[PDB]
């Protein structure tokens, strides 16, 4: 059964899923005082694609970004709800949601499927969500067994221990924003496997002078790229 | 493999699943209810928690009432009685809206063991786990104590004993005869039976002393004994 | 998991019946319904269902309304659940027909919805047996008898053997005396099953009769003059 | 529990394959073989059925609109029924007379919903509808349990449909009269059944016409049919 | 199964449900579509029996609405249900929104259907992958592929159904960006025919414009086979 | 292995396996402990950390002014558990005038552990809960998956919380003439028998009379700390 | 309307006129008003035509269900039971003043049932618009015990008071005996042109077809 | 929780069906004869059991009569259901229901249980005798759903044999006295054994008109 | 003042071996309007089996759609045409399954009872479906108090076809002329066993 526990403890189901998130393009997440960068590689499939169709960093609300991991229907259906959600919140209370709260909700509906109190099997789905709150910039990390975890810098995907162990390394709390973007880039050109460029990574970030969501074009790409090393 | 649902009879036409709750139910801790010549005495030995030194003194408590005079204990699991205590109560409001008087006790007892016995039809619900003590004891009538099992099954007592070591705390108990004994000359008796303390015992009754309606033991009856 | 559930085999049974049967019969309960010209009765053992436990309380005899009863046998739990099934049945028809449901009603009634049972595989037969006797509007009495299978017939005498009532009816063959006569034929043929002598305090008798519709027991000290007045 | 007694009746195999709408197929190739063609004239619609029996394949759906029958008879008549109601509220709903091929789309809907939700099994039986309506004049559909369904000319469905359809498309052509189309029907089901002559005691046979704008629908008896049986027989 | 879930995790972490309505998928027909300037061509394969199948009952080259096509390969059944929901879906974004459903909306919309069965207890996942073509809000033509996991994608030239692979690897290194409609056809029809026999009744080609949805009669698509043989040797 | 399938069956044994797996998924959360004299209560959890660039899981929560928790298992659940109880707690404050007895609130609590255990198609909550209140008194409670509660004089779960065991029965005798630095560096020291404690790893949080629930600051954390040492 | 029944040695006797209006108009000359409900039951009505005529026959096959199912002679008790539920769900509305005769078990029972779900065990009554010249009649000269014959002439000499006196009723005057044993029903118990020339009439069109 | 306990087996065929087939085949016999100017149905059956309590043929309408073989129970309930639907077909129209609309509704009553989810099918076979404007009907209606029309049929046990013997003494012009012989002969291939139904309203043999016969 | 908004009548007559139906043809508006005057009233069930319905013409059209799907899922089950009384007893129950909210409509049944004997079969209805079986003639609509004048003075037993024409086109078009909101054309159909007569009428459009 889905809700069956295991002998040691756990559900079967979201282990499972846990194998089912790290498939899938890689993402890094950084969080500095001026704002919160998002960046993903891009595993185009073939050439005929539309390579702007298939998207990774969505944006919940005007402040807050996500990029995900695992089974795209279900991190779609999630990202939808997470946006249904902070509307319904901007309406009632007609201010821009909390970080922490979005990723609250987005963990509530993610274990809907126990029915402790609908969705019928967990979502294979991981999302770094980062955005900007009246707190400042943030990014938090919530997997399928429903755990969010804050953190200053994260990756995800199938290169996800290979991106994390490069932020562990070449993480600093001072460094600035234009830092964070070399950083996110150094560490995606590492951990990615293809030649970096444009129209290869897709970034955006949230900053904290203006807590919009701001997706990068070319010639923001060739600008990081053209300083790094 | 006749024995993983409740809803399946084995060949032989038993029910497996009620033979393991009754397996469960004889490994809980004891209980007992004694009708003595002035009053019903309830007293529960909680042995399973010897271990546990942190829980608060005298905090675990497996008796309950309803209305004042009905005594109401159990062994087995302290969800599923309390479940069945929360519908004897509720049974007993419902009658109290619908008559106007307090509802009497067999109609009570009938009410409880259909309600338990309805939990061991069907294949999608878990069958409660605790057998059942009401008891109670007026002026005119002296005492009446109903022990309900976990399959629905009713019957009335001049004293009984649920839980482990049941059997002899029955044989100590047949020993005498207590219909012609007062409720504080048991007290004594009940606390000798458990030796062959202040704080894994529940103690309750009863009885005149107390005008017939449910009290914990004070203390300073207790200890004496 | 053919045997499990209440579908056929491939011998077209439904073994979960038989089984419900069977617990039926593991009871060790012995209950006998026979009628009189004018009159039936139900004898059936104070024993309960296989010291200071309260022999008075254990009875296998319910009233169903005043002037119908019945005998259950088989595990206690069903037993009270069928006799709380019975009584509804009997108080709805007496709202919505004006009037007392007779015996016969009664038990095809109790037969449907046990069919009911025996049909939807998610709920369990219930292992329970039952005698009910009354007086319907032509002032004769009726005794039907019902099993966990669903099947309920009219007798003139029932065990719930067969050729000790056969023995005793076809020996027989006032309304005081005819109530008299069919009590001691009961309490002779419970005897005679059981292959035992009798306790005048371990046997419950009911009786329905044209004098007295209601269904009523008989005091323990009746059925002493009675088992006294055998073998004498 | 329950899910352990439970089958998983709608429910993928490996293959991409129903199990339980491969059975009912298997059923209904173990059904009594059901055939239809279209004439100039109308539509044509034979089958193949102890001696005490007193039509259990071709039934009637509506004055435009006729069903041969194949698999388990119980669940077609519940089709037919079903078939029949929805016929009815078109014509309640619109004050026009059901287009053959919107009948079939949602009776094929039922079909196919039993093998897509709940956890009850599909629907054991396949239809030839025959009908006519003025869009598209004279029309046999074929449908199987799945819910998928075709357009046929002539089509049969059954035991030795193979033997069947080969009769059919070597004989079937474009222009037959209602004669000619009867005495085809005969011959493809003397031939599924392996017999040099068709018994007309095992026979069912009818046909939807267009006559004066009127659809009228004939359902053959015996002696009728012993009548074709004859002409069929000198040549 | 009236609510017991169909689809579940695997030990590895795969949902083996999605993967068979894959399988469904690749066991149905080959259907190819091309997008152009202001235009899209689809061209489905077909298979009949001759002499006996009405060849104009089946309909793999839908309609959808008055803007937007689709072509599917996998279950006929499943792809009915789906359209007729498309189409409902279609008809209540005209009515809210008092505007025509963009083609990207109506992906999406097949989309989340798809998710939806493949999310909820006691239904099974549509077995059928669709290309649909249509113009968005912006006049743009667009044509999107949705598979039967709920996952869709916009593609200048895509291929589903069986053999969808080696359609994949041809329309790669032919297609050309834009192209005039006489040689779009022409390159939807010689991609298509990579995997079927070659015969004008193993195709169905039509062409979307601006104004409606056109078959191509059959007197070209002959033409264009012979000239195929001619290239073909 | 045949009867421990669903959360209905009773084994031979007269156990219910599902549950006690629920259960078995307590042990495995990270240890809290909770102390209490005659007007307080302290609770100090270990703050769960996955990586270097993570942020502390939170190990208590406030469900009212005088009632706060601390978890052990699933944290879904635990959070599904705690909503049920902040609803219930302002329900109570809104349709009447005063605050929820805490017994009430806690046999409501088990009455929701123990409805799971009754049917198939649920399963049972897969955490336990301490909670720490002041009604009239400091009083601990300990909720179970199978809808067992107790009330403790001090009380501790999680990982290896057998040394943290040994400490509080070596210690029990003091907590109640202890005073509130005492006692808060009673149950600190306990919790470093679990194990190094830090403010970023330790949570502690007290509640008594005339004190409602609150968490300690890091400061007054960091002092503490030293004290410890 | 005028309906009327009694309760005579060992029968029940129900009178009825048979007369409809649509108001001030005579809508029907031979209107039947007594209602056979089963062998040993019979009622008439009062009121809104539709409300009695459709209440009746859905009486009428409940009792023939529920004799099936309890191969018992069915019982006046129930039919009155039965009447009042249905009445008395519909809080006064579908109004039927019945008179309700049969004989069972327990004897001859007459009923007369009210609109709104009362009933009342009577040896005579009568309903309708000549309900109170019936009733007149019935008073002047009822008596307890008398034979079927002094019954019936009884209810037909009421019934004709009604007709004679109420400008609602008129017509025949149908009458039913109902015994424990069978029933038998009176329908006429009592009884108290130009030819135009062929193609007179202009048409602008005519159209023969043949079946 | 609602699902299907009756399943396409890997042939096509629906085990459950066959076994409560096999179950009925198993069962007491009961046959039907369609004479000129009538219908019969005619059943077999320890000195404590009442006779009139235990009635196989019973009366669905005034002249509609049902007998049956296989399991009691289903057939007391379906029993109910089909007098149910006859109140209900006269409660619409008027007038008596039709034999052969009847016999239609009971099996998609009984279709209904061959495919709805968590039950079984009837463990029965009826034969369903009644007159209507359009003659004399004997309707066999099987545990699958199906129904047959019949001139003359045998639903139990041997049924075979039986089967043989009505085809071989059965004549389509023939009075009721002369199918009532052949149908007594049929079964005893005593008077208190016997249960026979005659199609006046559908009427049930006493004890005496059997044992003249 | 509902069934004012159309106006409308319908009239039924028997004869020997015979059966007249007729109605008015006009559909009116608020009373006054004269909108449509090929309005007619007249609906055929089966050969056998006719209705008249008059009254609000949405109600009209609707009950006709009942009537139409219920006979003919009863034919097409039976295999064979509804019997008269049974068309008549659906009929009364369908309108009482909408005491409450009803359709303001009064339909009128006419036919054949077939026994081969041709017994011709009239009921008039009211909104409810109480229902009047009468043996020589059946009045429903706004001008019901004049039909049941014409047909009470007028009426033969046992006339042929003709006479019946005859005799219910006179009362039909007498009764109308008195009526404002009812007229503007009459249909009449005659149905003997082996045939049906239809005519128009020429009649006032006043």
Redesign the interface.
């Known amino acids: 059964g889905v809700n069956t526990f295991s002998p040691e403890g756990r559900l079967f189901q979201v282990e499972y899923a846990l194998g089912a998130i790290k498939l899938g393009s890689t993402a890094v997440g950084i969080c500095v005082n001026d704002g919160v960068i998002l960046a993903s590689e891009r595993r185009i499939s073939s050439t005929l694609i539309e390579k702007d169709s298939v998207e990774k960093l969505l944006s919940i609300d005007d402040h807050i970004g996500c990029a995900m991991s695992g089974l795209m229907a279900d991190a779609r259906t999630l990202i939808d709800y997470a946006r249904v959600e902070c509307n319904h919140y901007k309406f009632i209370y007609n201010e821009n949601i909390n970080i922490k709260s979005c990723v609250e909700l987005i963990s509530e509906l993610a274990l809907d499927f126990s029915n402790l109190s609908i969705m019928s099997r967990p979502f294979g789905v991981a999302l770094l969500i980062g955005g900007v709150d009246k707190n400042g910039p943030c990014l938090w990390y919530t997997e399928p067994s429903g755990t969010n975890t804050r953190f200053s810098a994260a990756s995800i995907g199938s290169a996800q221990e290979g991106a994390e162990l490069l932020l562990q390394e070449n993480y600093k709390k001072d460094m600035t924003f234009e830092q964070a973007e070399i950083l996110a880039l150094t560490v995606l050109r590492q951990v990615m496997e293809d030649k970096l460029s444009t129209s290869n990574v897709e970034i955006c970030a949230i900053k904290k002078s203006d807590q919009t969501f701001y997706k990068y074009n070319t010639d923001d790409i060739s600008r990081i790229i053209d300083v790094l090393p | 493999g006749y024995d993983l649902s409740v809803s399946t009879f084995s060949p032989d036409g038993r029910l497996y699943q009620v033979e393991y709750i009754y397996k469960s139910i004889n490994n809980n801790n004891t209980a007992l209810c004694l009708e003595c010549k002035d009053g019903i005495i309830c007293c529960c030995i909680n042995s399973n928690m010897d271990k546990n030194k942190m829980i608060k003194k005298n905090s675990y408590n497996r008796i309950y009432h309803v209305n004042n005079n009905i005594i109401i204990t159990y062994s087995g699991f302290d969800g599923d009685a309390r479940n069945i205590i929360d519908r004897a109560r509720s049974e007993a409001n419902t009658y109290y809206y619908n008559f106007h008087t307090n509802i009497p006790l067999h109609i009570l007892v009938n009410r409880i063991s259909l309600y338990i016995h309805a939990y061991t039809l069907y294949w999608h619900m878990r069958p409660f786990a605790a057998s059942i003590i009401i008891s109670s004891f007026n002026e005119k009538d002296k005492g009446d104590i109903y022990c309900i099992e976990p399959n629905g099954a009713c019957y009335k007592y001049s004293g009984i004993v649920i839980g482990k070591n049941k059997e002899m705390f029955k044989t100590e108990i047949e020993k005498k005869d207590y219909k012609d004994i007062n409720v504080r000359d048991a007290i004594e008796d009940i606390y000798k039976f458990i030796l062959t303390l202040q704080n894994l015992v529940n103690f309750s009754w009863i009885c005149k002393e107390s005008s017939y309606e449910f009290q914990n033991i004070h203390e300073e009856i207790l200890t004496p004994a | 998991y053919d045997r499990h559930l209440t579908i056929f085999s491939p011998d077209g049974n439904l073994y979960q019946i038989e089984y419900a049967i069977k617990a039926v019969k593991n009871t060790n309960i012995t209950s006998v319904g026979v009628k009189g010209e004018n009159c039936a009765v139900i004898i059936s053992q104070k024993k309960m269902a296989t010291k200071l436990l309260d022999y008075n309380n254990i009875t296998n005899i319910y009233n169903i309304t005043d002037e119908i009863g019945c005998s259950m046998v088989g595990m206690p739990g069903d037993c009270l659940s069928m006799v709380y099934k019975a009584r509804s049945e009997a108080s709805e028809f007496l709202y919505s027909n004006g009037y007392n449901v007779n015996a016969e009603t009664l038990c095809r009634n109790i037969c449907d919805k046990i069919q009911v049972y025996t049909q939807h595989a998610y709920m369990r037969l219930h292992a329970c047996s039952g005698m009910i006797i009354g007086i319907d509007e032509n002032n004769k009495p009726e005794l039907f008898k019902f099993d966990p299978s669903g099947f309920c017939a009219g007798y003139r005498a029932c065990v719930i053997s067969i050729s000790v009532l056969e023995r005793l009816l076809e020996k027989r063959k006032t309304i005081d005396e005819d109530i008299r006569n069919t009590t001691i034929l009961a309490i002779e043929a419970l005897q005679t099953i059981l292959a035992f002598d009798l306790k005048a305090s371990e046997i419950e008798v009911a009786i329905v009769s044209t004098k007295n519709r209601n269904f009523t027991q008989i005091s323990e000290k009746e059925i002493d003059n009675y088992l006294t007045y055998i073998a004498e | 529990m329950a899910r352990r007694y439970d089958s998983r009746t709608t429910t993928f195999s490996p293959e991409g394959r129903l199990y339980q709408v491969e059975y009912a197929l298997e059923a209904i190739n173990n059904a009594s073989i059901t055939i239809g063609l279209i004439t100039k004239d109308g539509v044509i619609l034979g089958a193949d059925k102890s001696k005490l029996i007193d039509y259990e394949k071709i039934y009637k759906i509506d004055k435009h609109i006729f069903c041969g029958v194949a698999g388990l008879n119980a669940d077609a008549n519940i089709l037919i029924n079903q078939s029949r109601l929805y016929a009815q509220r078109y014509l309640y709903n619109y004050n026009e007379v059901q287009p053959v091929s919107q009948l079939v789309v949602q009776i094929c809907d039922i079909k196919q919903s039993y093998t897509q939700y709940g956890g009850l099994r599909p629907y054991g039986v396949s239809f030839l509808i025959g009908g006519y309506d003025t869009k598209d004049g004279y029309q046999l559909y074929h449908t199987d349990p799945s819910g998928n369904y075709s357009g046929w000319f002539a089509t049969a469905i059954g035991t030795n449909n193979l033997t069947a359809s080969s009769v059919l498309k070597q004989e079937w052509k474009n222009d037959m009269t209602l004669e000619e189309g009867l005495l085809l029907a005969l011959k493809t089901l003397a031939k599924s059944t392996d017999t040099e002559i068709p018994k007309s005691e095992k026979i069912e046979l009818a046909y939807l016409t267009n006559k004066d704008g009127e659809v009228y629908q004939k359902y053959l008896t015996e002696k009728e049919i012993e009548e074709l049986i004859k002409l069929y027989t000198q040549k | 199964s009236y609510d017991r879930a169909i689809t579940v995790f695997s030990p590895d972490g795969h949902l083996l449900q999605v993967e068979h309505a894959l399988e469904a998928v690749k066991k149905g027909g080959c259907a190819v579509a091309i997008k152009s300037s202001n235009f899209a061509v689809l061209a489905v394969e077909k298979k009949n029996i001759p002499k006996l199948q009405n060849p104009k009952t089946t309909e793999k080259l839908i309609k959808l609405d008055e803007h937007n096509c689709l072509a599917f390969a996998g279950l006929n059944a499943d792809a009915r249900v789906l359209v007729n929901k498309t189409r409902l879906e279609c008809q209540r974004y005209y009515l809210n929104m008092d505007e025509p459903a963009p083609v990207d909306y109506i992906a999406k919309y097949v989309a989340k259907v798809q998710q939806k069965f493949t999310h909820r207890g006691g239904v099974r996942p549509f077995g059928i992958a669709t290309l649909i073509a249509g113009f968005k809000n912006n006049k743009e033509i667009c044509i999107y592929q949705t598979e039967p996991s709920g996952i869709y994608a916009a593609w200048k030239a895509q291929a589903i159904g069986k053999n969808a692979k080696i359609v994949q690897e041809f329309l790669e290194k032919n297609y050309q960006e834009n192209m005039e409609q006489k040689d779009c056809i022409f390159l939807a029809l010689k991609a298509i025919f990579e995997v079927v026999e070659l015969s004008s009744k193993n195709v169905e080609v039509a062409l979307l414009t601006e104004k409606d949805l056109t078959f191509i009669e059959e007197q070209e698509i002959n033409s264009m086979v012979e000239l195929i043989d001619q290239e073909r040797t | 292995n045949l009867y421990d399938t669903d959360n209905i069956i009773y084994s031979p044994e007269g156990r219910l396996y599902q549950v006690e797996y629920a259960s078995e998924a307590i042990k495995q959360g990270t240890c809290a402990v909770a102390i209490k004299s005659k007007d307080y209560v302290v609770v100090s959890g270990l703050k769960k950390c996955i990586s270097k660039l993570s942020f502390p899981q939170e190990k208590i929560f406030k469900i009212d002014d005088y009632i706060g928790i601390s978890m052990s298992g699933i944290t879904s659940d635990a959070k599904v558990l705690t909503k049920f109880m902040q609803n219930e707690c302002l329900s109570h404050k809104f349709l009447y005038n005063e605050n929820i007895n805490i017994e009430s609130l806690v046999r409501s609590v088990a009455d929701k552990y123990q409805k799971n255990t009754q049917k198939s198609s649920k399963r049972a909550f897969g955490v336990g809960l301490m909670i720490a209140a002041y009604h009239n008194e400091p009083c601990i409670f300990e909720t179970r998956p199978n809808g067992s509660y107790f009330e403790y004089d001090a009380l501790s779960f999680g990982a290896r919380s057998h040394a943290s065991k040994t400490y509080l029965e070596k210690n029990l005798h003091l907590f109640e003439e202890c005073s509130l630095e005492e006692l808060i560096l009673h149950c600190l020291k306990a919790l470093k028998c679990s194990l190094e404690l830090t403010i970023s790893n330790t949570a502690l949080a007290v509640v008594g009379k005339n004190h409602p629930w609150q968490e300690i600051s890091s400061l007054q954390l960091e002092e503490y700390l030293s004290k410890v040492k | 309307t005028t309906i009327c029944g009694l309760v005579c040695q060992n029968a029940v006797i129900l009178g009825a006129d048979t007369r409809a209006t649509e108001g001030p108009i005579v809508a029907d000359k031979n209107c039947s008003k007594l209602h056979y409900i089963s062998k040993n039951i019979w009622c008439a009505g009062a009121g809104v035509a539709g409300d009695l005529e459709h209440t009746t026959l859905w009486l009428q096959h409940n009792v023939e269900l529920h004799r099936l199912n309890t191969n018992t002679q069915p019982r006046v008790s129930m039919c009155v039971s039965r009447l009042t539920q249905e009445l008395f769900k519909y809080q006064g509305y579908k109004v039927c003043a019945i008179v309700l005769g049969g004989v069972d078990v327990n004897g001859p029972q007459l009923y007369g049932i009210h609109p709104h779900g009362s009933s009342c065990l009577l040896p005579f009554t009568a309903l309708g618009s000549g309900s109170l010249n019936a009733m007149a009649v019935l008073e002047a000269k009822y008596r307890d015990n008398m034979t079927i014959e002094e019954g019936k002439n009884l209810v037909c000499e009421a019934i004709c008071a009604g007709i004679f006196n109420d400008l609602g009723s008129g017509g025949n005057v149908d009458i039913c005996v109902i015994t424990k044993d069978s029933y038998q029903h009176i329908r006429p118990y009592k009884e108290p042109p130009t030819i135009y020339p062929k193609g007179t009439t202009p048409i602008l069109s005519e159209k023969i077809e043949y079946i | 929780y609602s699902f299907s306990l009756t399943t396409f087996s890997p042939t096509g065929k629906l085990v459950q069906i066959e076994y409560a087939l096999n179950r009925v085949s198993s069962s007491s016999p009961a046959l039907g004869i369609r004479a000129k100017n009538g219908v019969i149905i005619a059943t077999e059956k320890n000195e404590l059991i009442e006779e009139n309590s235990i009635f196989k043929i019973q009366q669905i309408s005034e002249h509609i009569g049902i007998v049956y073989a296989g399991m009691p129970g289903d057939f007391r309930v379906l029993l109910k259901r089909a007098r149910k639907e006859a109140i209900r077909y006269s409660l619409q129209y008027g007038s008596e229901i039709l034999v052969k609309e009847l016999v239609k509704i009971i099996a998609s009553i009984v279709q209904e249980f061959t495919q709805t989810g968590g039950v079984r099918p009837f463990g029965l076979s009826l034969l369903i005798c009644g007159v209507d404007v359009y003659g004399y009907h004997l309707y066999q209606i099987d545990p699958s759903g199906c129904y047959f029309n019949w001139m003359a049929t045998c639903v139990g046990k041997d049924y075979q044999n039986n089967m043989s013997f009505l085809e071989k003494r059965y004549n389509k012009d023939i009075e009721i006295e002369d199918a009532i012989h052949t149908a007594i002969l049929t079964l005893k291939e005593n008077e208190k054994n016997i249960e026979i139904g005659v199609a006046k309203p559908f009427k049930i043999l006493t004890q005496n008109e059997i044992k003249d016969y | 003042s509902i069934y004012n908004y159309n106006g409308g009548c319908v009239l039924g007559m028997s004869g020997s071996n015979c059966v007249a139906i007729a109605c008015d043809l006009r559909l009116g508006a608020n009373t006054f309007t004269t909108v449509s005057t090929k309005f007619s009233k007249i609906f055929k069930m089966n050969?056998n089996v006719y209705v008249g319905l008059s009254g609000l013409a949405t109600d009209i059209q609707t009950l006709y759609?009942?009537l139409?799907?219920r006979v003919?899922?009863y034919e097409?089950?039976?295999?064979?045409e509804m019997?008269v009384?049974?068309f008549?007893?659906?009929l009364?129950?369908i309108?009482?399954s909408n005491?409450?909210s009803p359709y303001f409509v009064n339909p009128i049944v006419v036919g054949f009872k077939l026994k081969v004997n041709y017994e011709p079969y009239l009921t008039?209805y009211?909104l409810?479906?109480?229902?009047?079986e009468?043996?020589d003639f059946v009045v429903n609509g706004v001008t019901?108090?004049q039909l049941?004048g014409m047909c009470e003075?007028?009426?033969?037993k046992d006339?042929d076809e003709?006479?019946l024409?005859?005799?219910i086109?006179?009362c039909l078009?007498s009764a109308l002329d008195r009526d404002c909101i009812s007229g503007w054309g009459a249909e009449v159909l005659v149905l003997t066993?082996?045939?049906?007569?239809?005519?128009?009428?020429?009649a006032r459009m006043d």
């Open positions: 050969n759609e009942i139409r799907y003919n899922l097409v089950r039976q295999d064979a019997d009384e049974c008549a007893n659906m009364s129950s309108l009482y005491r409450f008039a009211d409810i479906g109480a229902k009047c009468t043996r019901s108090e049941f003075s007028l009426y033969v006339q003709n006479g024409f005859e005799t086109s006179q078009l066993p082996e045939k049906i007569i239809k005519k128009k009428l020429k």
